[PDB]
Amino acid sequence: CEEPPAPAPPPAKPKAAAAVPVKAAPTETGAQAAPSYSYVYNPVGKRDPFRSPI
Amino acid sequence: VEMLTSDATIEEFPEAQVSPFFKNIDLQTAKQVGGAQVGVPILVEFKITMTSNY
């Protein structure tokens, strides 16, 4: 078996913890967006039309 | 001013009333006109038709 911990080198963790870690990451990452928002808009209008045609 | 709905002929049943003298048929239309970069009005353009008394 292996004991409370195992023996001292530690043993053998060069297999466990080398075919592990992992690769962790760990990816403290890919969560939720606020997204972002665009802005509106450029006029004042001009007249030619539509004054005469109404 | 052809923001306006049309018409002026119908048959009217009272819902509510404040002037005993006037039979408004309905707020025929209402549209808040914002304006542009050349200037505001921002307000609510509207149209109403009303038969008075007698």
Q: Which two tokens stand for residue B32?
A: 């808040």
Q: Would you tell me how many other CB atoms lie within 10 Å of the CB of residue B46?
A: 13
Q: Cα B8–B13–B19 angle (5° rounding)? A: 85
How far is residue A37's CA from residue A41's CA, in Å, rounded to a whole number?
13
Convert chain A into a string of H (helix), E (strand) and C (coil).
Answer: CCCCCCCCCCCCHHHHHHHCCCCCCCCCCCCCCCCCCCCCCCCCCCCCCCCCCC
What technique determined this structure?
cryo-EM
Indicate the SS3 state at residue B3. coil
Residues A17, A18, A20, A21, CA torsion sign: positive
Q: Which two tokens stand for residue A32?
A: 């939720």
Number of residue pairs across A and B with CB atoms under 8 Å? Answer: 13
To the nearest whole Å, the CA of B11 is away from the closest chain A CA by 32
A18 alpha-carbon distance from chain centroid: 27
